[PDB]
């Protein structure tokens, strides 16, 4: 029932209403998600990182979506089968170095097996608290905005 475009637009809406991306941002992300897939498989649980290369970006932010039912994403690397994604990290990077820092931080946090197990059961407030604590401890992540309304379940 939940498509890729629905996920992209739902994760982009709070960034648009808070003034950190332009309106067309989502419409471009979808486009890039067709040409540059962002599907990742980390110990069964799938992860997607939709983002742009700085276009339509006013400030840095993360938008987290927790899919209760997996949605198929084309893999970052080639495979005969796609990736059943349950966790989506919408990335709004203004410069290339910000995008690289956020990508490295996401790579570091998705390998956390217990944290990825907790992400699929905690509420929005607890996910916000955990991700805020993990962002404050990262010296490369600070400068990226993260609010309570940047986390949502899509069931």
């Amino acid at each position: 029932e939940v498509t890729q475009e629905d996920i992209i637009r739902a994760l982009a809406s709070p960034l648009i209403k808070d003034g950190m991306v332009d309106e067309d941002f989502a419409e471009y992300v979808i486009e890039r998600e067709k040409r540059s897939p962002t599907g990742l498989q980390v110990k069964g649980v799938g992860v997607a990182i939709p983002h742009t290369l700085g276009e339509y970006v006013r400030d840095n932010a993360i938008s987290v979506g927790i899919l209760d039912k997996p949605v198929n994403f084309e893999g970052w690397y080639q495979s005969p089968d796609p990736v059943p994604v349950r966790v989506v990290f919408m990335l709004a990077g203004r410069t290339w170095d910000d995008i690289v820092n956020v990508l490295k931080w996401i790579k570091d946090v998705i390998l956390d097996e217990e944290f990825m197990k907790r992400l699929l059961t905690m509420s929005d407030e607890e996910i916000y608290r955990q991700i805020y604590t993990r962002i404050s401890k990262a010296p490369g992540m600070r400068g990226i905005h993260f609010k309570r309304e940047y986390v949502r379940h899509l069931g």
Partner: antibody, heavy 131, light 108 residues
Framework: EVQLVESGGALVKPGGSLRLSCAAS????????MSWVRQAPGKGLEWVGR??????????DYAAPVKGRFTISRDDSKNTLYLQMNSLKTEDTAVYYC??????????????????????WGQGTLVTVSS | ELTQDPAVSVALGQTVRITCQGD??????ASWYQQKPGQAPVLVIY???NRPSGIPDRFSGSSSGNTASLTITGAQAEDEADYYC????????????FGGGTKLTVLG
């Protein structure tokens, strides 16, 4: 759905000028890096030039056998790419394709190099430089 | 610069390995392009081993040191075409260089 149509291929005298156009459809042309590639009769692919988007500076780069004679411009409002060619020579006789440029980078490797490639190609227009 | 074999033969149904040689391939992936006689080049392999839109899974890409190899498993008559490799040459020579191209011939 992505369509790139070249136009402007005609006969031109050595030392003359010629402007090739390429109309783009099926994608946001404003955010796409564009490139011109050429292929001489019976030879291989030779990258002519490249132009970036306005978000990345709109800068332009050319190949050595083209520097000082060719120019690459773009009208994003018309979704059109232009290649102006001056001081033409017989070696410039070739089929010219307009390609779009995409980028790729690794995630797990730890290194984040950008590797650009040409994923969408037009059918090309033939420029003949003869007297 | 990038170096390819000018011509390569393969039996119908067998696996062929066309290779691209260049120093820059030590630190950059190569992109591969197929050009059938009178048509325009099409992208078949980009990055480590990625395929676009609707490209058959018979095409695979690999990199080992200073070489990059496009691997066609189960050759067919429609593969009889020219294949070009592309990567960033050295540094400030140009920016994108194509190999001389390999003319694939499917025999039987």
């Amino acid at each position: 759905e992505v369509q790139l149509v070249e136009s402007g291929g005609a006969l031109v005298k050595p030392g003359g000028s010629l402007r090739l156009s390429c109309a783009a459809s099926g994608f946001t042309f404003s955010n796409a890096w564009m490139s011109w590639v050429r292929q001489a009769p019976g030879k291989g692919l030779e990258w002519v030039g490249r132009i970036k988007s306005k978000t990345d500076g709109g800068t332009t780069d050319y190949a050595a056998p083209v520097k000082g004679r060719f120019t690459i411009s773009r009208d994003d409002s018309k979704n059109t790419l232009y290649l102006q060619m001056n001081s033409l020579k017989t070696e410039d006789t070739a089929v010219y394709y307009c390609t779009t440029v995409q980028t790729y980078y690794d995630f797990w490797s730890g290194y984040y190099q950008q590797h650009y490639y040409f994923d969408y190609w037009g059918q090309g227009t033939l420029v003949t430089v003869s007297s | 610069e990038l170096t390819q074999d000018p011509a390569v033969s393969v039996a119908l149904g067998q696996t062929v390995r066309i290779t691209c040689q260049g120093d820059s391939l030590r630190s950059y992936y190569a992109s591969w392009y197929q050009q059938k006689p009178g048509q325009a080049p099409v992208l078949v392999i980009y990055g480590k081993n990625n395929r676009p839109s609707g490209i058959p899974d018979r095409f695979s890409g690999s990199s080992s040191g200073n070489t990059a190899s496009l691997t066609i498993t189960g050759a067919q008559a429609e593969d009889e075409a020219d294949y070009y490799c592309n990567s960033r040459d050295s540094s400030g020579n140009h920016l994108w260089v194509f190999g001389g191209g390999t003319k694939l011939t499917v025999l039987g």
